[PDB]
Amino acid sequence: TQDSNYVRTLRQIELKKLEKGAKQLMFKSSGNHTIFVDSREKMNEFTPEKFFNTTSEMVNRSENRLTK
Amino acid sequence: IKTKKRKTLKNLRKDSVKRGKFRVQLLSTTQDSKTLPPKKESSIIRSKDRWLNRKALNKG
Amino acid sequence: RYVSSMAIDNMGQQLAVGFASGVISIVSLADLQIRLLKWHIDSVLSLSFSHDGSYLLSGGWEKV
Amino acid sequence: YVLTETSAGYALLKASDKKIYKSSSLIQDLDSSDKVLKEFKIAAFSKFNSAANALEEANSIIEGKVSSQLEKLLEEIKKDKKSTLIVSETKLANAINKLGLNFNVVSDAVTLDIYRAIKEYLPELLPGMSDNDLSKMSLGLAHSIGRHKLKF
Amino acid sequence: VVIEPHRHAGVYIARGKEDLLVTKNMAPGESVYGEKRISVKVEYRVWNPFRSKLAAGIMGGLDELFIAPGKKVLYLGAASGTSVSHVSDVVGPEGVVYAVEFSHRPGRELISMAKKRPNIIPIIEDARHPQKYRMLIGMVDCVFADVAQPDQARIIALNSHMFLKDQGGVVISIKANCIDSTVDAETVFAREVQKLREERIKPLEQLTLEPYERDHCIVVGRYMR
Amino acid sequence: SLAKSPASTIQILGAEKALFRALKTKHDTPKYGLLYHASLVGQATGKNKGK
Amino acid sequence: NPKAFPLADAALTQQILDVVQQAANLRQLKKGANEATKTLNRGISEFIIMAADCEPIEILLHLPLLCEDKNVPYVFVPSRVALGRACGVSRPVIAASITTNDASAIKTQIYAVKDKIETLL
Amino acid sequence: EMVIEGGKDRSIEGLCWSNVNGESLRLFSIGGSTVVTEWDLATGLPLRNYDCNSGVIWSISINDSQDKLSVGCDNGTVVLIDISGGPGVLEHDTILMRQEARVLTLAWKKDDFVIGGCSDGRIRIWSAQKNDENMGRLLHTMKVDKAKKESTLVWSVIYLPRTDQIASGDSTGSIKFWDFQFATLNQSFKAHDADVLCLTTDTDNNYVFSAGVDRKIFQFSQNTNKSQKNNRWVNSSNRLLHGNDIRAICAYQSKGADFLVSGGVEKTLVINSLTSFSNGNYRKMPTVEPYSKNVLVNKEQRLVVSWSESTVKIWTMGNYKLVCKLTLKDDQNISTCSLSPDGQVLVVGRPSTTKVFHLQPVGNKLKVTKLDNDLLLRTSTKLVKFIDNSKIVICSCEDDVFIVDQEVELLEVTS
Amino acid sequence: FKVAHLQNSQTNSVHGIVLLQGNNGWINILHSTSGLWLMGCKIEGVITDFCIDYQPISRGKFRTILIAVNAYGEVWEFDLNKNGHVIRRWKDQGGVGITKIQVGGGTTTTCPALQISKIKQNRWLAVGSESGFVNLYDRNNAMTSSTPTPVAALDQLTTTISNLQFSPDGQILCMASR
């Protein structure tokens, strides 16, 4: 029972290190973004920088896009 | 034209195409949403009639 | 509508009319409401009740 | 030719309309106000405006969270008794003080629109108060009623 | 060590040793719930996309988040300060958040953080009766919903028809299991955006926030009239 | 935060350094903690003050 | 008791106590409120069963408060006596935590009962 | 009297009336979807599509005193909908205590309890009595005798108020009567050979009629004084009247009307007598009585148009030859139609829009072209009847009478 | 099965019934001379055991009650001298795996009455369980409560109760485990 106590407190150390290490990281989002539009031409077009505003740097990663 | 008429029909009728990471859905019309109740869920309607036409009751 | 059998139970509450078509009909004698029992495919030849009146023996042209 | 009962604390406000009672309870689509349409349609008739007294504030708060037949509403029935006029209540569950004695009350499906207008422009013309003062008296009433219901 | 701004002021990205999202302070000096504090002379509280729900929508990318530093916002579902603290940080001392909840067990810490911030005013009444807090405040500039009740569309429809000015914002967080389990998120979210555009809410975007929550979505819309 | 802790924690609540050295090497943990100065534990004598 | 949220009906409580009996035979439950909260802290509990029968129920209704932090299912059954019979001791048992396992023989029964629990949340 | 049509891929599985005394009739109906649909009887349109907040609705029932509405859903939920707010306005009330299997049929005891048969072979009893301690939680569960080689589904549940029982038909064919208090079976009959889809009762609960996919209607009677003082139903009678199935059964009983009405997979209706079921006579209705027509002819070109759901077809006499058809699928539902004399322009018209098509006989075929008119495209049409080759008269679903190609003054009626 | 006595209750004619415990909740009662199925009583759950109680009514008339227990602990009492209809439904306090119910202190099926006037009402009712717990109810007062409390819960032997029998006077109960 005391070496089970030893392994259990080692496990709890790593558990707390895990949770308050993952609390201070940032993970890349992966969500199905959906945009609702009007009749058919707004859907046929490219969504023309409606929130990208550059098609090179600030389009395809969404953790912070920008408006210059 | 015989082998792709349903293809061009569905590809012109259907909406919500992809744009890279995104997907551009159409919103529907108050016309249809206020003239009709929504369609049946074919899953549950098929479940009920497939049950009433299961093989264990010998229909004929 | 020809009747070939009849039986009564020990209280006179119900009565079994067995017809030549094959059916049986339990009438309830206090109010003359009937209940049909159809198994005999030929004429019903014999009916009896049990003592408590809750079982009806019947016999006909099938040897059953 | 009508009044409307609007509250912000213990301070109740029976604000009269700049049109007829039928015009108030019939159209309601002509305000669309930026500020001037609500300023023209508005008329600060009666303001039973109490203070930051916790007793009066929590009393009208309980009467707002329940049926609205409080003493301030009796004061409004006193200060609007002209010819059994038409009133616009906020909540339909205040039916007792809505139709208790000589007041043709109406609160249905456009009364909410005119309450949207007058609640959008309460502080700009109805009192002699300012926006931070209205938010401070609202949060004082809110903390009072919160610590009253949620015990300590 | 380098703080860059976001699309919405009051929301920043602290890049450097940990490129992680962050808001300002309206609480001078202290954290509220043990969130990490970064100073760059100026104090900053880290938002978490897992501990909170709006931060996950920001991290998934919400362009016209109507929570914005020149408004006042109505929060129907916090139960505790862990999200409305960051909403008061982003709305700043100019405006006001109305954090309205029903279950008074974590309403204690809700009122406790509303003591520290005058930005946050609490309401301890259920959000299907907005008439019980008619007499407290009206005409908000953006509603937020985090209720996990089945009548989400009806509750926020009543709150937006009573307290939301025209052309304002609606942000609703929808859990799929609180409406319908055993059927997938795509059908239940399409059903809820149709249920919400039955009211005068033009839907703008939905996103599913998948690395932070299982089977959730955030739907934004503009209140028509 | 004290109420949502188990009763074993409330037993050893004061003696954290003795507890965690006696767990991080495989030794015997304390039995009194901050609760040693209660009057009932004062009335007890022997191993039954641990009890 | 009014403040014992989700309480099970008879069929669900019969299958809850059946899986409690076979977990007690497989030595896969921690019986008692302090052992249940220890498994809640360590994150090795599948679901928590409590008894809506203790005369202070506030000696119980604190492990809900850290069940809703670790999103572990919890349920109430009406009898502490019957929960003690199911756990297989001679005393009444107020709370019991079915611990986690991945090679367990009754893993499917545990999963079925915990899904029936989280339907009523 | 009237017909309320629905369109493509629309069905209707349950429907209930509601008439609070002094107010208008109200008609709610579920389809195969997540909403309840309340119809206003004037126009013949839905006036409300209330999306119930849990899953796909399998059954619907109306409270006694008709202020609440149960919808029993596919995810095991029973949702209460507050009806008494006025015609049209429906509120969510309470989701009752959940379960695993889908609840396939509902009934109410009174305003107090709600009984539900589910697809796991069980019959739950919830309490919908507001301001009780056990409101919403399921009080009892009963289990019917399962089939040996397939799953059992309880398909029909009714409450019998004269006694205190629940009658229940399940998919083994067995019909069981359960004492409500003590929640337990009194007697089981092994009546049908396959499922019992629908069962009903009369006013004083002297009879219970029942029917299902084995297409016989069974009658269970308790009319004898000994039957009433002993609480003993007997399997009285049995009739074979339907051709394929019986999916719906109901009963009406008044001073000059006592009939049970039944219909099924074969499309016809059947009327029998309630208190004289086995003895008396019955009437099998025609499968269609065209009070609203789907066919009309024009004497020029010897041609005839006919419209089924969302397609029209035209053929000529000669033999006969199908000259043209219009499977317009921009449409979803059809309604009435008329042709011009000389056979030039067809006009099809439904309660949402109408559309007019020029026709030109190109020989052994036709050529059909839409001619645009947005007034027609916006108007609701019931009847179009062609004053001239160009002028038609339009009756709108909101009681307007236009004359196009404009307004008839129409006096009002005493209400 | 269990064998018991039943009275016609329009004649004073008794006959033996055998009572068979079936699958769903069913008890099939049938005549002990002719084998005719008389009636059936269904309880809701897993039927595990049942017992027969008798109570006298007048000179020469008694009434037979079937007492059947769920596995979960809820007990049905069926009057079966009339049609097999429930008269009481109560719940065992505690007890989760219920294996064996027994009555005693009067005429049980194991202390049977030789003469119809010697039929007695049973005083005690023991519900013995899978953990070895035996609740003991005193039916001189525990026929009214509908959540009756046991007069004692015995716990002396620790594995599954498979026999529990009352002595004919009703002063000893015998717990036994196989």
PDB file of N, CA and C in Angstrom, chain D residues 7-9 60-61 64-65 90-91 112-113 116 119-120 138-139 141-143 146-147 149-151, chain E residues 104 107-108 111 114-115 118 121-122 124-125 132 134-139 161 164-166 223 225:
ATOM      1  N   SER D   7     -41.133  51.253 -15.881  1.00  0.00           N
ATOM      2  CA  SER D   7     -40.403  51.289 -14.624  1.00  0.00           C
ATOM      3  C   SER D   7     -38.900  51.251 -14.870  1.00  0.00           C
ATOM      4  N   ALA D   8     -38.152  51.788 -13.906  1.00  0.00           N
ATOM      5  CA  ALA D   8     -36.697  51.711 -13.919  1.00  0.00           C
ATOM      6  C   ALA D   8     -36.108  51.419 -12.547  1.00  0.00           C
ATOM      7  N   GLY D   9     -36.938  51.170 -11.541  1.00  0.00           N
ATOM      8  CA  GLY D   9     -36.520  50.950 -10.171  1.00  0.00           C
ATOM      9  C   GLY D   9     -37.740  51.030  -9.276  1.00  0.00           C
ATOM     10  N   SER D  60     -41.091  47.812  -4.850  1.00  0.00           N
ATOM     11  CA  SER D  60     -41.501  47.855  -6.247  1.00  0.00           C
ATOM     12  C   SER D  60     -40.845  46.754  -7.073  1.00  0.00           C
ATOM     13  N   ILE D  61     -39.687  46.242  -6.642  1.00  0.00           N
ATOM     14  CA  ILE D  61     -39.059  45.119  -7.330  1.00  0.00           C
ATOM     15  C   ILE D  61     -39.872  43.848  -7.140  1.00  0.00           C
ATOM     16  N   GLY D  64     -42.872  44.161  -9.182  1.00  0.00           N
ATOM     17  CA  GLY D  64     -42.588  44.014 -10.595  1.00  0.00           C
ATOM     18  C   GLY D  64     -42.369  42.564 -10.962  1.00  0.00           C
ATOM     19  N   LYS D  65     -41.735  41.814 -10.059  1.00  0.00           N
ATOM     20  CA  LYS D  65     -41.572  40.375 -10.226  1.00  0.00           C
ATOM     21  C   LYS D  65     -42.860  39.610  -9.958  1.00  0.00           C
ATOM     22  N   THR D  90     -47.034  46.903 -19.256  1.00  0.00           N
ATOM     23  CA  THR D  90     -45.903  46.178 -19.815  1.00  0.00           C
ATOM     24  C   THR D  90     -46.187  44.682 -19.856  1.00  0.00           C
ATOM     25  N   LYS D  91     -46.412  44.074 -18.695  1.00  0.00           N
ATOM     26  CA  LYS D  91     -46.647  42.641 -18.593  1.00  0.00           C
ATOM     27  C   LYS D  91     -48.136  42.341 -18.542  1.00  0.00           C
ATOM     28  N   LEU D 112     -45.394  45.922 -26.997  1.00  0.00           N
ATOM     29  CA  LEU D 112     -43.982  45.585 -26.891  1.00  0.00           C
ATOM     30  C   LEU D 112     -43.124  46.443 -27.814  1.00  0.00           C
ATOM     31  N   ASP D 113     -43.626  46.802 -29.002  1.00  0.00           N
ATOM     32  CA  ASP D 113     -42.861  47.669 -29.901  1.00  0.00           C
ATOM     33  C   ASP D 113     -42.728  49.080 -29.340  1.00  0.00           C
ATOM     34  N   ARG D 116     -40.314  48.971 -26.660  1.00  0.00           N
ATOM     35  CA  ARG D 116     -38.966  48.959 -27.218  1.00  0.00           C
ATOM     36  C   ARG D 116     -38.499  50.371 -27.519  1.00  0.00           C
ATOM     37  N   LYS D 119     -38.184  52.307 -24.056  1.00  0.00           N
ATOM     38  CA  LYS D 119     -37.083  51.763 -23.285  1.00  0.00           C
ATOM     39  C   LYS D 119     -35.749  52.017 -23.962  1.00  0.00           C
ATOM     40  N   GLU D 120     -35.750  52.188 -25.284  1.00  0.00           N
ATOM     41  CA  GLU D 120     -34.550  52.634 -25.968  1.00  0.00           C
ATOM     42  C   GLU D 120     -34.221  54.064 -25.590  1.00  0.00           C
ATOM     43  N   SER D 138     -29.824  51.106 -11.648  1.00  0.00           N
ATOM     44  CA  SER D 138     -30.239  49.769 -12.045  1.00  0.00           C
ATOM     45  C   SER D 138     -29.398  48.700 -11.362  1.00  0.00           C
ATOM     46  N   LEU D 139     -28.085  48.913 -11.244  1.00  0.00           N
ATOM     47  CA  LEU D 139     -27.274  47.909 -10.573  1.00  0.00           C
ATOM     48  C   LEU D 139     -27.433  47.940  -9.063  1.00  0.00           C
ATOM     49  N   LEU D 141     -30.422  48.520  -7.602  1.00  0.00           N
ATOM     50  CA  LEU D 141     -31.638  47.720  -7.481  1.00  0.00           C
ATOM     51  C   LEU D 141     -31.364  46.242  -7.737  1.00  0.00           C
ATOM     52  N   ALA D 142     -30.479  45.944  -8.693  1.00  0.00           N
ATOM     53  CA  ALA D 142     -30.174  44.564  -9.053  1.00  0.00           C
ATOM     54  C   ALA D 142     -29.453  43.843  -7.929  1.00  0.00           C
ATOM     55  N   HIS D 143     -28.449  44.485  -7.330  1.00  0.00           N
ATOM     56  CA  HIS D 143     -27.749  43.867  -6.209  1.00  0.00           C
ATOM     57  C   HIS D 143     -28.653  43.731  -4.993  1.00  0.00           C
ATOM     58  N   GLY D 146     -30.973  40.820  -5.779  1.00  0.00           N
ATOM     59  CA  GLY D 146     -30.214  39.584  -5.840  1.00  0.00           C
ATOM     60  C   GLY D 146     -29.861  39.065  -4.464  1.00  0.00           C
ATOM     61  N   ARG D 147     -29.347  39.942  -3.599  1.00  0.00           N
ATOM     62  CA  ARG D 147     -29.088  39.527  -2.230  1.00  0.00           C
ATOM     63  C   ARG D 147     -30.362  39.311  -1.429  1.00  0.00           C
ATOM     64  N   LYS D 149     -33.229  37.721  -2.847  1.00  0.00           N
ATOM     65  CA  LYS D 149     -33.660  36.382  -3.242  1.00  0.00           C
ATOM     66  C   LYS D 149     -32.605  35.338  -2.891  1.00  0.00           C
ATOM     67  N   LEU D 150     -31.422  35.447  -3.488  1.00  0.00           N
ATOM     68  CA  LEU D 150     -30.280  34.633  -3.099  1.00  0.00           C
ATOM     69  C   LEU D 150     -29.825  35.096  -1.724  1.00  0.00           C
ATOM     70  N   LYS D 151     -30.086  34.291  -0.698  1.00  0.00           N
ATOM     71  CA  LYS D 151     -29.864  34.720   0.680  1.00  0.00           C
ATOM     72  C   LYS D 151     -28.373  34.836   0.970  1.00  0.00           C
TER      73      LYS D 151
ATOM     74  N   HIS E 104     -29.314  29.455  -8.505  1.00  0.00           N
ATOM     75  CA  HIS E 104     -28.614  30.330  -7.580  1.00  0.00           C
ATOM     76  C   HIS E 104     -27.523  29.628  -6.794  1.00  0.00           C
ATOM     77  N   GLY E 107     -24.684  31.348  -8.773  1.00  0.00           N
ATOM     78  CA  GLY E 107     -24.986  32.765  -8.706  1.00  0.00           C
ATOM     79  C   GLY E 107     -24.300  33.487  -7.564  1.00  0.00           C
ATOM     80  N   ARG E 108     -23.874  32.757  -6.532  1.00  0.00           N
ATOM     81  CA  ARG E 108     -23.064  33.337  -5.469  1.00  0.00           C
ATOM     82  C   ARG E 108     -21.754  33.896  -6.010  1.00  0.00           C
ATOM     83  N   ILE E 111     -22.481  36.941  -8.405  1.00  0.00           N
ATOM     84  CA  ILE E 111     -22.613  38.197  -7.674  1.00  0.00           C
ATOM     85  C   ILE E 111     -21.285  38.594  -7.035  1.00  0.00           C
ATOM     86  N   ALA E 114     -19.400  40.220  -9.705  1.00  0.00           N
ATOM     87  CA  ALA E 114     -20.091  41.469 -10.006  1.00  0.00           C
ATOM     88  C   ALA E 114     -19.885  42.521  -8.921  1.00  0.00           C
ATOM     89  N   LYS E 115     -19.470  42.117  -7.721  1.00  0.00           N
ATOM     90  CA  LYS E 115     -19.022  43.092  -6.731  1.00  0.00           C
ATOM     91  C   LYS E 115     -17.751  43.780  -7.196  1.00  0.00           C
ATOM     92  N   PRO E 118     -17.974  46.780 -11.789  1.00  0.00           N
ATOM     93  CA  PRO E 118     -19.262  47.456 -11.989  1.00  0.00           C
ATOM     94  C   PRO E 118     -19.806  47.293 -13.392  1.00  0.00           C
ATOM     95  N   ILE E 121     -23.596  43.454 -14.185  1.00  0.00           N
ATOM     96  CA  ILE E 121     -24.714  43.482 -13.252  1.00  0.00           C
ATOM     97  C   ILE E 121     -25.443  42.146 -13.375  1.00  0.00           C
ATOM     98  N   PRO E 122     -25.797  41.525 -12.266  1.00  0.00           N
ATOM     99  CA  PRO E 122     -26.402  40.198 -12.337  1.00  0.00           C
ATOM    100  C   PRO E 122     -27.915  40.235 -12.299  1.00  0.00           C
ATOM    101  N   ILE E 124     -30.913  37.227 -11.320  1.00  0.00           N
ATOM    102  CA  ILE E 124     -30.935  35.894 -10.728  1.00  0.00           C
ATOM    103  C   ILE E 124     -32.315  35.305 -10.987  1.00  0.00           C
ATOM    104  N   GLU E 125     -32.845  35.568 -12.173  1.00  0.00           N
ATOM    105  CA  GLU E 125     -34.156  35.075 -12.554  1.00  0.00           C
ATOM    106  C   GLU E 125     -34.025  34.302 -13.858  1.00  0.00           C
ATOM    107  N   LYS E 132     -39.993  39.555 -15.672  1.00  0.00           N
ATOM    108  CA  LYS E 132     -39.634  39.708 -14.274  1.00  0.00           C
ATOM    109  C   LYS E 132     -38.416  40.593 -14.077  1.00  0.00           C
ATOM    110  N   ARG E 134     -38.042  43.104 -16.662  1.00  0.00           N
ATOM    111  CA  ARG E 134     -38.420  44.318 -17.387  1.00  0.00           C
ATOM    112  C   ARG E 134     -37.845  45.556 -16.726  1.00  0.00           C
ATOM    113  N   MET E 135     -38.118  45.707 -15.434  1.00  0.00           N
ATOM    114  CA  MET E 135     -37.875  46.921 -14.672  1.00  0.00           C
ATOM    115  C   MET E 135     -36.438  47.073 -14.242  1.00  0.00           C
ATOM    116  N   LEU E 136     -35.522  46.349 -14.868  1.00  0.00           N
ATOM    117  CA  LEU E 136     -34.120  46.436 -14.517  1.00  0.00           C
ATOM    118  C   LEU E 136     -33.315  47.086 -15.622  1.00  0.00           C
ATOM    119  N   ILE E 137     -33.400  46.577 -16.854  1.00  0.00           N
ATOM    120  CA  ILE E 137     -32.730  47.210 -17.986  1.00  0.00           C
ATOM    121  C   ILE E 137     -33.408  46.765 -19.276  1.00  0.00           C
ATOM    122  N   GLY E 138     -33.262  47.585 -20.331  1.00  0.00           N
ATOM    123  CA  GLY E 138     -33.725  47.222 -21.652  1.00  0.00           C
ATOM    124  C   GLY E 138     -32.780  47.712 -22.731  1.00  0.00           C
ATOM    125  N   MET E 139     -33.046  47.234 -23.951  1.00  0.00           N
ATOM    126  CA  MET E 139     -32.411  47.659 -25.202  1.00  0.00           C
ATOM    127  C   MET E 139     -30.898  47.439 -25.189  1.00  0.00           C
ATOM    128  N   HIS E 161     -36.835  39.835 -28.450  1.00  0.00           N
ATOM    129  CA  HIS E 161     -38.003  40.643 -28.750  1.00  0.00           C
ATOM    130  C   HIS E 161     -38.338  41.599 -27.627  1.00  0.00           C
ATOM    131  N   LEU E 164     -33.612  43.556 -27.216  1.00  0.00           N
ATOM    132  CA  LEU E 164     -32.564  43.742 -28.209  1.00  0.00           C
ATOM    133  C   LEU E 164     -33.018  44.774 -29.226  1.00  0.00           C
ATOM    134  N   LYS E 165     -32.207  45.807 -29.420  1.00  0.00           N
ATOM    135  CA  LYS E 165     -32.519  46.819 -30.410  1.00  0.00           C
ATOM    136  C   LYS E 165     -32.303  46.260 -31.815  1.00  0.00           C
ATOM    137  N   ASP E 166     -32.853  46.967 -32.798  1.00  0.00           N
ATOM    138  CA  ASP E 166     -32.863  46.488 -34.170  1.00  0.00           C
ATOM    139  C   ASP E 166     -31.459  46.453 -34.752  1.00  0.00           C
ATOM    140  N   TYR E 223     -30.410  40.647 -35.758  1.00  0.00           N
ATOM    141  CA  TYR E 223     -31.821  40.773 -35.427  1.00  0.00           C
ATOM    142  C   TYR E 223     -32.493  41.694 -36.433  1.00  0.00           C
ATOM    143  N   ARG E 225     -36.253  43.133 -38.066  1.00  0.00           N
ATOM    144  CA  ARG E 225     -37.465  43.638 -37.434  1.00  0.00           C
ATOM    145  C   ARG E 225     -38.502  44.048 -38.476  1.00  0.00           C
TER     146      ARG E 225
END
